[PDB]
Amino acid sequence: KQVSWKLVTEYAMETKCDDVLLLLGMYLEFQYSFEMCLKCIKKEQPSHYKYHEKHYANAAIFADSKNQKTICQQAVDTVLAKKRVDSLQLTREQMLTNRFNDLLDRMDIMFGSTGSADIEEWMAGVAWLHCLLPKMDSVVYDFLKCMVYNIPKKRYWLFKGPIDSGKTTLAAALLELCGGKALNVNLPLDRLNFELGVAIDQFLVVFEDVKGTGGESRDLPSGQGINNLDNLRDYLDGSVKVNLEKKHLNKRTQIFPPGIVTMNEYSVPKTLQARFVKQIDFRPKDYLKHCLERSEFLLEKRIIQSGIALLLMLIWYRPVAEFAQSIQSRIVEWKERLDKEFSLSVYQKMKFNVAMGIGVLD
Amino acid sequence: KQVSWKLVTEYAMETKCDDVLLLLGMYLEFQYSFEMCLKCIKKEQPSHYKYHEKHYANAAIFADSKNQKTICQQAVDTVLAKKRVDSLQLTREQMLTNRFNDLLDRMDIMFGSTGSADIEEWMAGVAWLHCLLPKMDSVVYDFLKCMVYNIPKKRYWLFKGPIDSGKTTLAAALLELCGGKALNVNLPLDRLNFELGVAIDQFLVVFEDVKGTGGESRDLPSGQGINNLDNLRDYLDGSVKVNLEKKHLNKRTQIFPPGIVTMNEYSVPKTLQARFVKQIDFRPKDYLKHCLERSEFLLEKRIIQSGIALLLMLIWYRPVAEFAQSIQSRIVEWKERLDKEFSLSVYQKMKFNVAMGIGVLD
Amino acid sequence: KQVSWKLVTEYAMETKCDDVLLLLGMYLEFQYSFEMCLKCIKKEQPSHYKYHEKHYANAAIFADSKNQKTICQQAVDTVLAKKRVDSLQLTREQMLTNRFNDLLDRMDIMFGSTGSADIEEWMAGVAWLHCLLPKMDSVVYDFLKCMVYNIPKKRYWLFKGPIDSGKTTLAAALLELCGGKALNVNLPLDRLNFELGVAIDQFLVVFEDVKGTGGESRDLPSGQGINNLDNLRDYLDGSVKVNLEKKHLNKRTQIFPPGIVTMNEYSVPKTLQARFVKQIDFRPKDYLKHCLERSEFLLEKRIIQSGIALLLMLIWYRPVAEFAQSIQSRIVEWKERLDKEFSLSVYQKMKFNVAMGIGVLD
Amino acid sequence: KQVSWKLVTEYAMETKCDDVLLLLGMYLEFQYSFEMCLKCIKKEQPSHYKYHEKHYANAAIFADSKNQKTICQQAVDTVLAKKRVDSLQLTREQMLTNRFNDLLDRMDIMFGSTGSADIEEWMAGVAWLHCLLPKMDSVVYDFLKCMVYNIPKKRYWLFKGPIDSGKTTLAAALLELCGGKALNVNLPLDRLNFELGVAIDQFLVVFEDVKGTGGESRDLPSGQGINNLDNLRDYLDGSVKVNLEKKHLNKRTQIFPPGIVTMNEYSVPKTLQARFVKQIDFRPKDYLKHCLERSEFLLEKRIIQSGIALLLMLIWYRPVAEFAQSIQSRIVEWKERLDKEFSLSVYQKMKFNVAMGIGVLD
Amino acid sequence: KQVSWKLVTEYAMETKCDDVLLLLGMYLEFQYSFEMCLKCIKKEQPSHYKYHEKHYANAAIFADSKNQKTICQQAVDTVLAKKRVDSLQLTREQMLTNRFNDLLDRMDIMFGSTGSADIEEWMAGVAWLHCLLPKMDSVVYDFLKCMVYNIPKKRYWLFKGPIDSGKTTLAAALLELCGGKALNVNLPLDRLNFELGVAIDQFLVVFEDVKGTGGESRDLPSGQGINNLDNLRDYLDGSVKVNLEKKHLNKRTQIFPPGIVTMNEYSVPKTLQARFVKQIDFRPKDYLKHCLERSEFLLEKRIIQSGIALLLMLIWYRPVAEFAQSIQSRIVEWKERLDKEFSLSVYQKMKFNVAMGIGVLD
DNA sequence: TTTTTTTT
Ligand SMILES: Nc1ncnc2c1ncn2[C@@H]1O[C@H](COP(=O)(O)OP(=O)(O)OP(=O)(O)O)[C@@H](O)[C@H]1O
């Protein structure tokens, strides 16, 4: 009896899988008895346990096929085709709206009954992040709209401050929230072409840790990056399309994505200073160090790195109207959860503790 | 029954699509019952909502096919094949006439009942552009004549001026108008081999901000561009066919397109200067800057970059006799719509406002 | 019923096509009723309207087929096979005789009843070329013999002088006449290898403006050209076979064709000097400059650089016995047409006009 | 009603054709009625007229097939396979015995009833050749045996010095005689590692004007040639197998053929120089130029570069005992014809003219 | 009826053929009747005449097949798989035991029914091999222990001493008995890092003459050798797995095999010598060069290079118990064939002919 | 499988 290629493709769509080998392996597992499946019973992975029951029948026939890799190819093509349709047609607002739906799906599992994540510890993260910069929550909302509107010239933000001052931590959480990529531009100029190649179809980019020239008088090690950026004006201003390259692959032409730049106190040419919308100073604050020293579970679980943490901050601080209308229904349910889960006083006690440099919890 | 490969080919032809994945993803959207299609109801994409109902039945059968990518590859071949047939058999004038028809179709949508753009905002951009150079519309017609005739060794125009004097802005508009590609010649002198490969079958090309060398009193970063261009005199001259290459492709051969070179005020080896028909000196101007600062919607919607803006200028300024005969019919209708919309006094008000450096609209 | 692959192959033989996409594109056009076919009614392209009625019945079936690119590939390889058989078995004289029939056929169209070209404008071109050098028509007869005899280490002519001397123009016309290829050697020493692969099965080749070294003493930037050719002596000599790459293909092995090298004046190693059988120096002549400046349809139609103009020059000047015996009938016909179409006095006055730098015509 | 792939393969064997396009082109000629075949009637090519009638019926059925290239690919592979099997099984003396039978069969045609050339002219060539250096036939007989006995690190003779010494002239004739290959050392060593792959299954090889270093006293431009000679010294010595590259097929390892190499009088180290046997740089004899100047049909017909000239010279001079036994029949058969044509006084008269700078005949 | 794919696969295992072209070619020969197969009748090639009669029926049907190359590809895969299994499963001991069995089978063939070799020739070869230093049969055998044992550190000896000493000739000869390869060492380690990877998967390895840094100052031309291996702490030592590259490949890495190094009488820093268990000076000693000046067959038929000569030096001097335990049966029988034909005294005449430079054969 | 890349 015949295999349904359709049922495979539906699984690939719903897992959003795009690796042929990864798709193949997981479908083959469904061939074993669903009714006894140990992986189902232990509820180990949703991509398995949500689906084994449905696909078991087809997986048995799949296991006898001789066309196995061919079936998977057509399935994975369908997922890649969907992405390319989306990329060429969605509004940037709708792109973001999808991305939040994915994070909210993950949170539903994480804080579920089988979920590992301690909603209390993750809210300790938000308390710490909200201390990192004044008006933190508004700053995020401003950055977000800036990426969505993507207005020419008004496109790029500068993070400035000493080593161990948090700028990478915040950048990483934003990049997770938005699904960009990091880039390094300190290379010899000829090398840049495949670096910039990374940007293709990305929503954000982060230029990490740009080195200037001079300031080794202040022990800042010198390098190319500042001068390279001054030479890339059209990519920053983002008014016109540019050509981007990948290894073995034809060039593609597109608007260069908006993004973030991070540095120590190198001297910045006035040319570059005109490019940035906002400069944010990061400074080491001694009380945060002593707090982290007493609340290491933040680092151990990588809480303060995560876009998941920033999304919780937005849900706590921003009005429901500020989110894209379609997801507001989920937002209200999460607001309701958090309102039930914490009094404002217990949350505010954490902020006070962080200001004491004391461990977050008491 | 069975898939009609013919219907898929027709869809590819009508959408003028030449990505196999985009075609695949697009066609798959039609598999759902037409009568409920929210994309149709929301009138989001004409390349969807025109076609769903017609293609529906075959899209459902296609969804079951075991052969899907083969069908799409054949369809994309016919679209690519038509481009090559046209490249060899059309006159350069006919090409331009076709390109204009496409832009005019986009203009029918933009300013159509879907109401999706403001014809007044777009007309403001023409005022700002008609300021950017003396006799601006005459310069466009001369450039168009130059590009249609394609006189050998009289094929290239040189743009120079300081930074911030609009030259890439003007190049971008001409490039969207004609169709073509930009190129970067400041590369290492080997990968030029693949860089120049982008010129294949194009109509224009633009070489962007070619770096000269030395004279650093000019405060100009040095690079390969000028000396490297002087090693490519042949490609400018366009007197004989040349050989062109892409990744994994064996060489095409054809005449290298006509086009534009842009640079800062470096000094030119006159052997290359001998290959430029005409040279245009851009100046920074204050009232442009002040007007533009008070007219930001121009930039926020990329109006002054966009080929539609130049086409609107020609329609306003030029006699109907100057257009190729078949589109004179559409040109007349657009002229009527413009004169209906705008008095000459309104246009003169706008131009005076640009000259006054106030926000254009008053 | 089924597609005839044989009929497709026959059309490819008839058209002497080579791009599988060009073949595919053009054959698809026949699917519409030739009865109505607008292109036929315009009589626009002979490659179409001579064949549409014949191929229509089979094109309708081809339009449905699932194999289309496969059918086309077989036909293209049939044409390529024919070329290889010809290349291995014709005398060089017969090859040229075939090539001349192709030009004569086009000329029968050029000045046919459809008569898109004016024979008087085209004859004006011949006068300008005959003026360009001493004994021009004798020089052309010499060059043809040299290329046909293909005597080893007596195979290459060097053109040199200043810029705008016309050397490229003359090369371009000779190249068109014999149907060679043009090659660049001012290039990366590695990728020369795929570059030279173009010359497989070609009758003739031309190297363009081969850059010398130490040239900038004379205002000429130095380059790879001479530095490359001094290696390739065996390719010039044509005394022994050499082996030729193509991308994704194993090497051919054959004698490298005879040809021409152009340069602006540079120092030549005496080793390389020994391998050019003839030297020609070209000089600017301001009366020619003024004449083209008036008679600019010469440039716009590219008349002065067509091999058709050289063929016409030979027809006017050379005895019929100098032509290969087969074509002598068509030669007598065209001689008679031309002697009828122009007096000697007309041609004499054209020369005086050109000599006097006035526009050619009065 | 079906193609005999066997009959196709027999033609490929009997022609010893080993190019798939060449065979394809060849066989398709047979589809027309051999009855009318102008090539047959003309006795145009033996590869045609011997075979047309035999293969006609099969060729008509082949002309309709849809597998045409696949059929030819299998046929070509049997030819390459046969070469490989002979290549390892046969004695080096046995190889030459086959090669000579090939050339003799050609001479049968050249001087046949078709008689397209005449032994008169060719013997004048022999006179010019045997004149060129002392005792020429003997030193050829030596070089032959050297290549049969193939002593390791003793496999190579060299010629050096003046341009137009004739060293290429001598080399080319030897290569046409043996059926070796020629290769170029002067490319980047990496490219050589692929290029040397052509040496597969060759009795003999040569390399021409390999660019050494120094010799600037003689204005010789230095290069990578000797660098890569100094590299490949195992290939030179043939004391061991080494690997040989191909595209789309495995590289194969075997011992390397013997040969000749030639250069201008560059430097090259004695870690080479000592190896070689019986090297002769030889230098001009001007009166030969003057005979040549008067006997130019030699060069036009490439006679003094044809290996057929050498074979005629050996037939003329050498005892019948000097040759392998089977061919001694045909040796005598030809040696009769030389006597039957020529008195000694003919050859004597020729060598007077040659010695005395007049054209060979009087 | 149909081709047995199985029978074709047997012949590949039988002949150990592993080239698809050779397999195809030889198998096609069997299509004629073995019954009067003249190759069989002449007994020329066992790889033919041993098999023809069995395979004939299958070969006839094979010659009629249309899939022929596909059949052969599978058969060659079989032999390749068979090899790759053994390469992973077996000990160096077992591997070397098989290798002796093969070379002893070549010994059997050489001195076989044909008498194609006369062992006295190889006694003279062995007598020459004996000359170099005392008991060197044992010292070879003891090195071969070091090779099989591959005990860490205890892996490497150094062949010091000048040109033509045979030291590379002998090191190469072991590659017949054992496989392996030699490599250069005289760039800075910088480049040699791209060259070390040819040591991968080698049974054993060899290294060419270590130059001293600036060694021209020591009258031995320069190259950066010693300071490279002064500092490659581990590579010759070989406890744990090393890291390596073949230029433009990847770091598949494992143990660095044991091997030989040589030098042309250069100097040695301590950490270079620490790489070896031994260092020995090799010279082209006076009577030895004189005996080669007087003894020729030992070079002419490559005896001095062949592994067969090394095997016989061991059979002539190593006692049976030292050999591969089952092969010792054959070792006795060859020892018998030695003693059957030579006393040690007649062999001592040869030793003394070498020892006093007079020609060996006597 | 090459090609492109990588090296350069
Ligand atoms: N504002 C801060 N005050 C004190 N300590 C900080 C602060 N921000 C970060 N930290 C400490 O610095 C460590 C590294 O943080 P982070 O990577 O964000 O710093 P950074 O300045 O962006 O570094 P880099 O420039 O190296 O990428 C954190 O794990 C934490 O221990």
Ligand SMILES: Nc1ncnc2c1ncn2[C@@H]1O[C@H](COP(=O)(O)OP(=O)(O)OP(=O)(O)O)[C@@H](O)[C@H]1O
């Ligand atoms: N003539 C002008 N005078 C003043 N400001 C100008 C002028 N033209 C452009 N601008 C401003 O400069 C910005 C950049 O324009 P554009 O990028 O085309 O110029 P450019 O710097 O000269 O270009 P290029 O990249 O070719 O060197 C515009 O978006 C506008 O804000």
Ligand SMILES: Nc1ncnc2c1ncn2[C@@H]1O[C@H](COP(=O)(O)OP(=O)(O)OP(=O)(O)O)[C@@H](O)[C@H]1O
């Ligand atoms: N002898 C001449 N006298 C004056 N003008 C000339 C002459 N020959 C050519 N021209 C002008 O020079 C233009 C370029 O000619 P052409 O490209 O053949 O010259 P070239 O010497 O080969 O140049 P380059 O070195 O730039 O390739 C022609 O189109 C014509 O306008």
Ligand SMILES: Nc1ncnc2c1ncn2[C@@H]1O[C@H](COP(=O)(O)OP(=O)(O)OP(=O)(O)O)[C@@H](O)[C@H]1O
């Ligand atoms: N003995 C000779 N005297 C004069 N000219 C000679 C003599 N031998 C050969 N030549 C000339 O040398 C020309 C080229 O021959 P060939 O290519 O064999 O020489 P070559 O020394 O190998 O040259 P190169 O080093 O330039 O390749 C011949 O066409 C002939 O005219």
Ligand SMILES: Nc1ncnc2c1ncn2[C@@H]1O[C@H](COP(=O)(O)OP(=O)(O)OP(=O)(O)O)[C@@H](O)[C@H]1O
């Ligand atoms: N002891 C010897 N004396 C003289 N000649 C010898 C001796 N041994 C071998 N030969 C001959 O010299 C040739 C070269 O020997 P080989 O290359 O092995 O010496 P080498 O000392 O390793 O030299 P190099 O240091 O130059 O590589 C041998 O193949 C053989 O023909």
